Write a protein that binds this ligand. Sequence first.
Ligand SMILES: CC(=O)N[C@H]1[C@@H](OP(=O)(O)OP(=O)(O)OC[C@H]2O[C@@H](n3ccc(=O)[nH]c3=O)[C@H](O)[C@@H]2O)O[C@H](CO)[C@@H](O)[C@@H]1O[C@@](CF)(OP(=O)(O)O)C(=O)O
Ligand SMILES: CC(=O)N[C@H]1[C@@H](OP(=O)(O)OP(=O)(O)OC[C@H]2O[C@@H](n3ccc(=O)[nH]c3=O)[C@H](O)[C@@H]2O)O[C@H](CO)[C@@H](O)[C@@H]1O[C@@](CF)(OP(=O)(O)O)C(=O)O
Ligand SMILES: CC(=O)N[C@H]1[C@@H](OP(=O)(O)OP(=O)(O)OC[C@H]2O[C@@H](n3ccc(=O)[nH]c3=O)[C@H](O)[C@@H]2O)O[C@H](CO)[C@@H](O)[C@@H]1O[C@@](CF)(OP(=O)(O)O)C(=O)O
Lengths: 418, 418, 418
Amino acid sequence: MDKFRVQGPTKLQGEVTISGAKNAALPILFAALLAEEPVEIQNVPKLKDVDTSMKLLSQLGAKVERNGSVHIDARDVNVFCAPYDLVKTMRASIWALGPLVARFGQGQVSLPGGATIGARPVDLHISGLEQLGATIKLEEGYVKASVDGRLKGAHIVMDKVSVGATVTIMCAATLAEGTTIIENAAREPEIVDTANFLITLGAKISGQGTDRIVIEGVERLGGGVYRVLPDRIETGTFLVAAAISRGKIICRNAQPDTLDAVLAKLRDAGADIEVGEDWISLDMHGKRPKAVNVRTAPHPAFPTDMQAQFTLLNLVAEGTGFITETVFENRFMHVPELSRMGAHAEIESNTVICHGVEKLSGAQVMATDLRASASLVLAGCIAEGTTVVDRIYHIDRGYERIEDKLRALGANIERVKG
Amino acid sequence: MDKFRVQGPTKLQGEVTISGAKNAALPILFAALLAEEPVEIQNVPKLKDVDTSMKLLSQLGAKVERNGSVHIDARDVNVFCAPYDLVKTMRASIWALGPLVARFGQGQVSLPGGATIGARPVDLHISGLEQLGATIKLEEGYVKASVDGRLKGAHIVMDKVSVGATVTIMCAATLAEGTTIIENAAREPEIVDTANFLITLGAKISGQGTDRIVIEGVERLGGGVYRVLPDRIETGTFLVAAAISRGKIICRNAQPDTLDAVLAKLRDAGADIEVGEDWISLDMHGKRPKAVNVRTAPHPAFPTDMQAQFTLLNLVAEGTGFITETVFENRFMHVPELSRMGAHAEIESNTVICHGVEKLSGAQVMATDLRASASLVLAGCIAEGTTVVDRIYHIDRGYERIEDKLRALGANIERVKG
Amino acid sequence: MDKFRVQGPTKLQGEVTISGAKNAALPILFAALLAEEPVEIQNVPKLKDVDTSMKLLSQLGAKVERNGSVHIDARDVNVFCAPYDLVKTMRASIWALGPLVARFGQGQVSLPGGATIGARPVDLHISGLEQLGATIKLEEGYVKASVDGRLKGAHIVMDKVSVGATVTIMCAATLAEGTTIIENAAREPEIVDTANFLITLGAKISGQGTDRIVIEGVERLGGGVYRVLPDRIETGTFLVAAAISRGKIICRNAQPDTLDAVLAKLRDAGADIEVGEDWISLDMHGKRPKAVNVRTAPHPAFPTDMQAQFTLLNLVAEGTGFITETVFENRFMHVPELSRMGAHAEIESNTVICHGVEKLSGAQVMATDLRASASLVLAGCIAEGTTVVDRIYHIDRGYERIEDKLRALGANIERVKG
Ligand SMILES: CC(=O)N[C@H]1[C@@H](OP(=O)(O)OP(=O)(O)OC[C@H]2O[C@@H](n3ccc(=O)[nH]c3=O)[C@H](O)[C@@H]2O)O[C@H](CO)[C@@H](O)[C@@H]1O[C@@](CF)(OP(=O)(O)O)C(=O)O
Ligand SMILES: CC(=O)N[C@H]1[C@@H](OP(=O)(O)OP(=O)(O)OC[C@H]2O[C@@H](n3ccc(=O)[nH]c3=O)[C@H](O)[C@@H]2O)O[C@H](CO)[C@@H](O)[C@@H]1O[C@@](CF)(OP(=O)(O)O)C(=O)O
Ligand SMILES: CC(=O)N[C@H]1[C@@H](OP(=O)(O)OP(=O)(O)OC[C@H]2O[C@@H](n3ccc(=O)[nH]c3=O)[C@H](O)[C@@H]2O)O[C@H](CO)[C@@H](O)[C@@H]1O[C@@](CF)(OP(=O)(O)O)C(=O)O
C-alpha cells in the first residue's frame, strides 16, 4: 500500500504548470463512444481513472492510444457491456451507459460500487435516460439500459443539480429524435467543456454554462480535435498549498474564470491574488491565512471539491472559520485525520467549525478520498516533523505527477513501498 | 431570497391566536380527492403548501376556492397524474396517490425530491398500497400506481411508525373491498383528524388515536363540512417563544390535549402552565428556563417537530440539557447556526448535548428547514443585536402570518427584499 | 420494558465459560433448510434470535427441538414464505431465502425492517442470488425470489465485503449446477464454521477463511452433527469487562485464534494476556488500561462488533484513544449514553476521539443496540453509584445468561420489572 512520507515544515513556493481537468477528461472520454470518425483529445492528464476509462473504451471495441492526448477511434465498438473488472474501480464508467443507449440501443454498466463521500445514487441518470425513451432494468449488480430505435428528446427538469446526470442526459440527447431541454442543468465548466466537445463532433447544443441546456438530436457524430480545459481543483489545490504555507506561487496553464469563488475566498484569507489570461499568482507575503467562512454548493458557488483543502487552510489560519458542506454528506472524513495532527475542529451536522492553530504536528494519517488525500499531503508539508499519509493511491486519481510538482515548490515528499 | 432581520433582545409576551394544523390540513386536502359531493374544510391555515396542494387539486380537475376555509368540489377530477411543477415543492403530494388509486384505479405522483431532515423514503406508502392491491411502478421520477378494479382490504402490520404511510393506507382503504386493519398505526392527532374527516364524508373507520386502525370499505364517499384542529407545533413554538424570553403568553384556539408531552417538558424548564379547554398560558415569571432532557419519538411522546425549538430553549437555559432525536436522521442542521450566535452544543451521534448560555449574540444565519427557520427567528428575538435569517421562505410553509404574530408579542422583525 | 440496575464500582474478576457463537449459530440454523436428513447442531447459545429462528424453521415445516443443541429435521419443509411476525424481530431471517431458492425453486422473506447501526441493505444477497440464476422481485415489503429449475453456479466477485451476503451465496451455491466462485469473500470465523457445517452435510466447498471461496454444487445434502465455535465477541466482551475494571479473568471454551486483533489491542491497553488451546486469560495486575487506537474493518482486522466495548475501554483508560468505525455508519449511539455517565468523547465523522477519565459516574442510560447494551452494562459495573440501563432486551439477543455470568465475576446487577 504505497504511503507518502512528508517532512515539514516546508514552504511551498515556486511555480506549477496546471493539468487538464480530471473531471472534463473523464466525461469526454465516454462521450467519444458516440463518435463515428476518429477523435483526438488533447491535454488529458495521466490519472488512474483516465487509464481505467481507456481500458474500457477498448474493451468495448474502440481503438485507443495516448500520450499527451488520448486517441480514440470508436467506429467499431461492438461490445455494449462493461466488464465489472474495469468498472468497480471507477464511478465514472456510468457514463458509458448513455452513449451506448443513444447510439447502439443498449448498454450495460455495473452499478458503481464503493462509496466514500456519500451514498452517491445514480437515480438521476436512470431517470433521464428513461425520460428520453430508455428502458432500464437493474439486476445482478448491473444497470441494463435499452431502447428499440432512437431515443426521443424530452423536456427534462432536473430535480436536483447533478453534474453527472446532466452529462448523461446531455450526451444521450445528442443522438435523439428531436429536442431535449434540461432545466436546472448543472452549470460547471466541465459540463460546458464536454458540451463543446460534443459540438466539435457536430452535436447541436446550446445554453451550457446556463441552467437550461438545449440539445437537438442529430443522426451521427463525427470526429475531431478537442483540448481539455485546465483543472480548477488542481489549481485551487496548489493555491491553497501556498497560502497555508505562507508562500507564493504561479499557476501556469490556468483558467481564472473557473475559480472566481475560490479566489475571492483566498482574497479573504488574506492572499495577494493576481491573474492573467492563462495564469494565476498568489502571494501571501510571508503571512498566515485568516479564517474564512465557506458554504459549498454547485457552480458557480464554492466547489465541494475544494472543501477539504479549505478545511486545512482554516485549521492553520488566524481565527474561527465555519465550513458548511452541502453537496455531499460524508465529506468530513479528512477532519479526524487532521485532528491527529493537532487541529481544532468541532463538527456540528453539516458544518465543520474551525479553530485555527499556528502549527500542526507531523503525524500518521490516512487517506480516505481524493481531495482528502491531497489535503493530508499539503498538511504534512507544513506540519512539524513527519507525516505519513497511508493509502496514497487516492491521490493518483486526480493529481498527475504531484510529488514532482510539490517537490518543485520545495516540498519534501517521499513515496514508500508499503 | 427574502430574509428576516430581527433585533434583540426582546421579550415575547402577549397573546396569540393559534391556526389550523398545517399537518392536518395537508392530509385532508388530499383525502378530499375521494369525495364525491362538495367539501368544505374550515380553519385551513394559509401556508405555502396549502397553496401548492390547491393548485394540484385543480390541476386534476377539482373545483377549488378558499379563504378561511378551502372549498373543494372533486366530482369531476379527470387527470390522474400530478405535474412535476406542483409536486417538487412539496413532499405532501404523495398523498394524492392513494386517493387516485382507490377511487380511479390509477394515479401517478412524482417521487418527492429534495430532502432535508433525512432520506425520507416512501416505501411504506408503496408497500401498503401494494398490499391492498395496487401495482406500483417507479419510472421517470414517478410513482405510477394502478389497480384494475377495487382494492381489497388487507391486514397491514406497519413495520415502523409513519404518520404519512398510515394516511395513505387509511385513505386508500376507505374505498376498498372489505376490511383493512393497520397495526402499529401512527397515533398522532392529525391522523385522528384526518380519519374523522373521512368519517364525515362517510367512511367507516375506528380506532384512530390507537395503534390499530380499522377501516371497512364503502363504495362512495360524500361531502360535508370539517373544521381543522389547532396546530400543536405552532402552539409549541409560541410557548417556547415565551419561555426562552422569560415572558408569558396566552394561546388562544388551542387544543391542550395534543401537547401533553411538551407541556410537561416546559413544566420542567420551569414554566407556569395553565390550561383551559381551548387555551393554554405559560408564565415564566421573569425567570430563565432550566435545562431539560428530551428524546423524540412518535405521538404521544415528545414530537420531533418541536426538537429544534427545544434545542434553542436548552442552549439558553440553566444547565446541561441532552436532546436525542430519534425519528429523523438529519434534523440538527439548526445547531451550527445557533452556534454562530454563541451557543454551546456538542453533537454525539443522535444526541445534541446542550450547555445553556445566558445570552446569544445576534448573527447571520441560515434557514435549513421549517422548524429550524422558526427556531432561528425566535433565537434572534432574544439575541443581542441583529440577526438576519436567510431563506425565510421555509417559515412560510407552516406559520401563517408569523411576523405579525411575533410582532404582536413585542418582537422586532423585518422582512427584507433579497 | 426490562432494565438493568447496576451498582458500582465493582471489580470483574473470576472466570467465565464462553458460549457458542450467536453469529455462527444463526447462519447454520438457516443453512439447515437445505438438509435432507436430520441435523444436530451442538453448542447453540440461548439467544432471542435463536428462538425466533427456530420458530420460523418450524413455521416452514421443519421439525425442531432443542436444549444444549438444536435438533432440526427439515425433510418436510413445505412452506416457503416466512411470516412477517417472526421475521421483523430479526434481520437474520433473510438467510432463509437462499436455502429456499436453491432447494425449492422459490422463497419469500420480508425485507428486514428496523435499522439501528446503519441502513443495512441486502442488495448483495439479491445480487448474488440473481447472478446464480434467481429472479427476485420486491413487493409488499417482501423479497420474493424464485428460479425454475436449479441455480447455475457462477463466478461472483463481491463488490464489498459482506459476511451475510457471502453466506447467502455460499449456501445457495451448494445446490447449484456447477461451480461457484466467490471473490472477495468475507473471511470471518462464522463463515468458515458455516461452510464446515455445509461440508458435514456433504457440500463441496473450499477456500473459506480465504478471500475466495469455491463451491461445487451437489444434488442433495444430508444430515449430521456440528458443534458451534466459541463466540469471540462474547469473549472480547468479557476480556474488556476485566481490563476496564482492573481485574483478571479466565475465558473457558474459547478459541484464541479468532481474536488475534483484539488480543493485540488489549496487549496495548496494557493487559497481561495468556492463551492456551481453548482458553484465554487476561491480567491487568491492578492497573488501569492505556488508550489504544482502533480502526475497524473485516476479519481478520479489528471487529466492528467490539468497537462499542473498546469505546468504553478508551473512555476510562489513560490517554487519548481514537477509534474509527468503518464497517457500519451509525454505530456510535453508545457514545452520548456513555457521556451522560461522565465520559469525554468528540465525534468527528467516522471517528470517536476519546479522552480517558479515571472514573465514570453511575447514570441512567439507554440501550440502542446489542453491543451498545453490553457496553453500557459493563460501564455501570465500573461506574460510581447506580446505573440503570433501559431496554435491556437487546442484550438478550447475543449474551446468554449474562447477569449470571457477570455476577459470577462479582458484579452487582439486577433486572427490574419495567
Ligand atoms: C468524475 C466527476 O465528474 N466527478 C465530479 C462530479 O461527480 P458527480 O457527478 O457524482 O456529482 P453529482 O453532481 O452528480 O452529485 C451531486 C449530488 O447529487 C447526488 N446525486 C448525483 C447523481 C444522481 O443520480 N443522484 C444523486 O442523488 C450526489 O450523490 C450528490 O449528493 O461532480 C461532483 C460534484 O460537484 C464532484 O464533486 C466530482 O468530483 C470528484 C468526486 F467528487 O470525482 P469523483 O467522481 O472521481 O470522485 C472529485 O474529484 O473529488
Ligand atoms: C406534512 C406532514 O404530515 N408532515 C409531518 C409527517 O411527515 P412524515 O409523514 O413524512 O412522517 P413519517 O412519520 O412518515 O416519517 C417517519 C420516519 O419514517 C421514515 N419513513 C416514512 C415514510 C416511509 O414510507 N418510509 C419511511 O422510512 C421517515 O423518512 C422518518 O425517518 O410526520 C412527521 C413525523 O412525526 C413530521 O415530523 C412532518 O412534519 C413536517 C416535516 F417533518 O412537515 P413536512 O412534511 O412539511 O416537512 C414539519 O412540519 O416539520
Ligand atoms: C447475525 C450476523 O451475522 N450478524 C453479523 C454480520 O451481519 P451482516 O451480515 O449484516 O454484516 P455485513 O457484513 O453483511 O455488512 C457489512 C457492510 O455491508 C453493508 N451491506 C451488507 C449486506 C448487503 O447486502 N449490502 C450491504 O451494503 C452493511 O449494511 C455494512 O455497512 O456481520 C456484521 C459485520 O462484521 C456483524 O457486525 C453482525 O453482528 C451483529 C450486528 F452487527 O448481529 P446482528 O445482525 O444481530 O445485529 C452484532 O452481534 O453486533
